[PDB]
Each structure stands twice: as C-alpha cells, then as structure tokens.
Ligand SMILES: OC[C@H]1O[C@@H](S[C@@H]2O[C@H](CO)[C@H](O)[C@H](n3cc(-c4ccsc4)nn3)[C@H]2O)[C@H](O)[C@@H](n2cc(-c3ccsc3)nn2)[C@H]1O
C-alpha cells in the first residue's frame with residue numbers, strides 16, 4: 382500500500398532479482414509479492430517476526446485470480462529486526478528459488494506457469510534500499 | 516512505458532536516487548521519467564543519440580496534468596551507445612540535479628514543486644540493472 386511497487390520487470394527464468402532492505406527495529410512482518418499483478422502472484426513471501434500467531438516463521442503462498450493458494454512454512458528464520466537484509470530470487474518452470482542471508486536457500490513450487498515475473502510489491506516493516514537485476 | 520515502472524518511491528528533497536542501466540548498442544534515445552505519476556513529471560530526461568532530428572543532445576521537459584512544458588536542451592553529451600550509464604538524481608525547492616560520477620551535472624528547474632518523487636519510468640534503448648535509494 383505504501384511500499385515500493387515495480388512493474389514491467391520482465392524477469393525471465395534463470396535471471397536473478399536481488400532486493401536489499403532495512404528491517405525496522407520493531408518489525409512484525411514484511412512482504413515481498415512477485416508475479417503478474419496484485420491478483421496473480423507466483424510468490425507471496427512473508428517473514429513473520431510476530432504476526433497472526435506466528436513467531437519467527439517464513440510463510441509463503443501464491444495467489445491465482447484473486448484466490449490465495451495453500452500456505453507453506455519454512456523452519457529456518459535468518460532475519461533479525463533492526464538490520465539490513467538481502468533476498469535473492471530466481472525461477473524455472475517447476476520452482477521459485479529464494480536465497481536468504483546465512484546461505485539459506487529454499488524452493489517454492491511455481492504454481493502459475495507465467496512466462497516472466499513482471500510485478501513486484503514490497504510491504505510491511507521493510508524499507509527497500511536497493512533492487513538489482515542480473 | 517514498456518521499460519521499468521516504479522511507484523511509491525517517496526523520495527524526499529535531499530535524497531539521492533541512483534540508477535544504473537545498459538545503453539543498447541545502437542541506441543536512438545532513452546527516457547527517464549520522474550514525478551508523481553505518468554501525467555505529472557517534474558523531469559522527463561531524454562538523451563538522444565539520433566532521434567527526431569537531434570544528434571547527441573539531451574532534451575529535458577516536464578509534464579503537468581497531461582500537458583508537456585517547454586523543452587530545455589543541453590550541449591554536453593557524456594553517454595555512449597553499448598555501455599553502462601550511472602545517473603544520480605536529487606531535488607530541492609528550486610531545481611532537480613542530475614549528476615554523473617564522471618563529474619557532469621545538469622540542473623532543471625523544479626516546475627511542479629512536488630514534495631516527493633513517487634514515480635519513475637524508463638523507456639527506450641536503456642535497460643535498468645540497479646536502482647538504489649539513499
Ligand atoms: O484465512 C485465515 C488465514 O489467515 C492467514 S494470514 C494472511 O496470510 C496470507 C498468505 O497466506 C497473507 O500473508 C496475508 N497478508 C499479510 C499481508 C501483510 C503483511 C505485512 S504488510 C501486509 N498482506 N496479506 C495474511 O493476512 C494465516 O497465515 C492462516 N494461518 C495461520 C496459521 C497458524 C496460526 C498459528 S499456528 C498456524 N496457519 N494458517 C489463516 O489463519
């Protein structure tokens with residue numbers, strides 16, 4: 382809503398989106414949304430420090446034609462409130478791969494089968510400093 | 516327009532936007548548009564290598580509620596086709612200042628007196644690699 386929105390990204394399979402930002406000292410959560418547009422998201426990436434009953438959990442989901450998909454959570458949580466955080470995303474036909482701080486990586490199934498990622502929105506307690514394409 | 520569009524930038528006076536991109540190998544021109552939205556641009560920055568009868572000339576303009584303003588042209592042209600260009604943009608009450616690390620500096624009057632820059636668009640023969648806020 383107040384976070385950075387970017388469109389016409391034209392990110393193709395195998396290309397790296399690198400995002401760096403500042404996690405607020407009192408962060409509750411933040412969101413990186415990636416897909417075609419606000420209703421069609423091949424990845425909703427939502428680290429929760431303390432939000433919706435979740436402590437230090439990464440929640441991921443997709444959104445297809447307005448409808449949220451089946452949620453998935455990861456065990457690993459390498460984000461700290463009040464510090465700078467970089468996240469690196471790529472995709473292929475089968476999966477999105479997200480590489481985190483501390484060398485941590487995980488896959489989320491690609492559920493939309495889009496030609497490219499064209500849309501990104503940040504929200505929550507995360508101030509983007511830097512976005513790069515590779 | 517078909518290159519990157521970014522909104523909710525909330526760049527305030529004194530803050531630096533840095534953009535790095537690739538100038539196509541037979542570039543005719545590129546555009547960086549900065550402002551409130553597509554119809555309200557405090558800076559339309561348009562380096563022309565060979566386009567609309569202009570050769571190696573920078574053309575700047577504003578747009579205010581859909582209406583183009585008066586063109587301002589600059590003599591110096593520190594860009595080359597097929598290379599990497601970095602541009603640093605800031606503003607204050609009187610002027611926008613477009614800077615290059617190579618020491619070139621252009622001023623354009625701040626004709627719209629907007630309080631923040633919230634919108635940035637790239638078009639033409641220029642691919643954005645990196646955008647940073649500080
Ligand atoms: O239908 C109810 C569900 O609500 C969702 S919360 C919902 O989830 C979305 C992604 O699936 C987005 O993340 C959506 N969001 C968050 C933001 C946001 C965050 C920061 S700025 C904007 N912008 N949209 C956020 O509101 C919980 O995750 C679900 N849940 C809870 C638990 C649980 C609790 C304790 S132990 C297990 N297990 N599943 C369940 O309760």
Ligand SMILES: OC[C@H]1O[C@@H](S[C@@H]2O[C@H](CO)[C@H](O)[C@H](n3cc(-c4ccsc4)nn3)[C@H]2O)[C@H](O)[C@@H](n2cc(-c3ccsc3)nn2)[C@H]1O
Nearest residue numbers: 544545546559561567568569574575576583586638639640
């Ligand atoms: O309508 C006629 C005028 O057209 C404009 S071109 C018009 O100008 C805009 C900013 O004023 C934008 O730049 C606009 N653009 C360019 C792009 C673009 C570029 C790359 S991707 C998209 N997206 N909009 C671009 O179409 C010429 O500039 C005018 N001109 C040139 C000269 C001249 C020649 C030698 S000395 C003086 N004397 N008049 C004149 O011909």
